[PDB]
Each structure stands twice: as structure tokens, then as C-alpha cells.
Amino acid sequence: GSSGSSGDVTYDGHPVPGSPYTVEASLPPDPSKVKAHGPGLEGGLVGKPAEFTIDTKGAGTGGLGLTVEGPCEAKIECSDNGDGTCSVSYLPTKPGEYFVNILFEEVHIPGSPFKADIEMPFDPSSGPSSG
Template sequence: MARLPRFQSLTVALADRSGKAVAIDVLDNNDGSFTVKYTAPRPGAYQLNVVFAGAQVPPIEINVEPQVDTSGIRVTGLENAIVTVNCEQEVHVFTPDGDNTRIVITSPSGSIVEAVIESTDTGFRVCFTPSEIGDYSISVTYRDLPVGAPYLLHSVPDGNKAEAEYVVSRCGPPRADLVTVTGPGLGPVIAQRSTHVFIDTTSAGFGDIDLFVDGPTRTPIHCVDNHDGTLTMYYVPKTPGVYYLRVMFDSNHISGSPFQVLAVPALLASSLTADREKTESSFTTLSSGSSTPKTAPCV
């Protein structure tokens, strides 16, 4: 029980469900209000009683939830953040308490995706097939608390792979200076979210296109042949920092390459001072010489 010296007519007491008193600290805010601080010794129901000028204020019921530790929960199978539409995907959720772990997959259109969730000795095996093109969100919660940020997968069409051979023009010598790159992927971009650039080679002549994304971490990339002399390259910057997009045509940099791209955290509005040490990612080579792109099957 606590009594404030300046207000002798006010008393405050906190007790657990068995009636055992809990130590409290009542602070006068000097504006007619008070702050009550306490540390609950264990989860459960508590009751705060306030008496003012001899009159009992209706008791305040407090329910203290157990402390939730999500450090033992992790998700694997998301190393390649770009996947192919209509190909089954599999991820594994490791959790020590499956009864209180929930997994929800949301499609690009906002609908909940049906998934096969199987219990394993270490958690769950989750299988689903993306049927739409765009960003899929995988949310994992433990006792209604989110485990990290939602995990993102970007689904792309199945007819074009990054290794496809591609005719960028039917005639003329290679002209790297005539290749243009536009789109949101030139930055600034948001870490852990898919972005893309649009590459126009319609006036560039014959030649190979090599695409690289260099940055703090290895970066998945995926190219889509638009069959009109243009292509779209998708990539996911996994961590905040400075990335470099290199576009080579016939072994020469195009105008503006390498493009410097800043990736920022989703909740951070200010600019970051990023480590500029580059780690080369996997690269894409698009070669002239065939009018039919070679595609790889779903794996």
C-alpha cells in the first residue's frame, strides 16, 4: 500500500489473485494525476485498489501475460526471394511451441493463400503454390506477437529465366550507349522488398547483356524477356545499404552504369550512411543469337 505525503486521503494498493501484496511506487505528476509503477512477480490476475477521501474507487483488474520469447523461432527456405508462379514452394518454420505459432500467407491481391502445413519434429513444413504474379507475404506469429517482419517472396512469370538467350535487335552493331534503364529499382528502394528496372535495348543492335547487382549481401535477381526488345529485371535488396546495378552491353557499360542504389529499412525515413564495400551477386547474361528464349522448368 502506498500513501502520498501531499495527499494523505489517497491510498493505492496492488495484490495478486491470492491477496498477496505487490510492491508499488506511486509518483505524483504534479498535475492532479499519478503514475503507479510495479513489477509483477509472475503472470496472472492482479487487482489495483484505490481509496480516495475514504471512498473506494472501483477496483482495476490487471491481467499480466507471460513474457514471450520468440528468439527460438526461425524460418528457412526463403534464400531465393524470387520464385516462379505456379511452382510449389516449401518453407520450414522452426518453433519449440507449435500450438501457439500461427502462419499466414497473403497473396499480392490480399487474399489468404491455402497452404499445406505439416507438423514436424522441429516445427512445421509449409507448402503452397503461388498463383499470382507479385509479392507474397508470409507472416509468423507466436502468441499473437509477430516474429520478425513479414517474410516476402516475389512471384514472376514462368516463361522466362535469367539464363535465357535473347535477341535484343535484329540488325546493327552493338551500341551500349543506346541501352536505357528506368524504373523504381534505380532507388531509393526499401530493403527486403522486391523492386525492378526496365531495360530498353530496341536500338542497341546485336550484343550480350550482363546484369549484376553488387551490395552488402548476395542479391537474388530475375530477368523477364518482354519479347519486344525490352526486359524487366527484378531484384530484392536483403539488407539496408548501398547497392550498385551494373548493366553491360557487349562487355561495355551502358550510360550511367554502374547505377548507385540506396536501400533503406522500411521504418526508417532518413538517409543511411552505408558500408560501400561491395559483394558481387549472381549475374544474368542475356545473349543474342536466338529468337526463342530458353527456359528452365520449375524446380
């Protein structure tokens, strides 16, 4: 087979001023607190990357199920950021309507799905150029 190659990003943070001797992983899954805001929600462009910012810090610990209930089968890339947020990016195939189903621990958050209106991408600059 084959393979690729990539580097690694570094970050620096500090534990809560309360009990830094804990993994702050002892909290109930509060979806009502889970907020979802970003461009990927309002919409985007075809064959273009679209993601948003998800707030979990003020929610707890567990799992989130993201599914694109659209007319087509768009890929969904969900990866952790490290700052207590989720960087999910999707790539549509046709300009229509995508309902991002956001549920925490089998619990639909107050705001999902998030209808995202996708539009057609503009055309690149070519023609009037000499070289």
C-alpha cells in the first residue's frame, strides 16, 4: 500500500484555579449547554470545506453523534482541537440543504439540526491575464 506524512502542532494551557489536581473529567453530560455556532451551520459552498465551533467545555464529558441528513452523502471529518472544542468539517456535493444532527449522548441539543444553505462556488480569475 501507500502512506503520507504530517507534522505535529503544540499548545500550552493551564488547569482550573480550583482543583488542578484533577482531570476535570468528572462531570455529567449537559447537552443544553452544548452550543453550536459557525459558518458551516449557516451554509457554505459545494465541494468546499465547511466547519463550525462547538462548545463542550460547559457541557461535560461523553460523546457526540453528528450526521448529515442531506439529499446526498457528504463526508464528515470530526476531530478534536484540544482547547475543549470540536472542529468538524464537511464537504457537500451539490447545492441543497444539509441538516447537521447534533446530539450529545443520544440527546438532541437545543438547536439541531442546523439547516445549512449551500451555494455554488464562484469562478477563478482567468482570461484577462497575459502570462
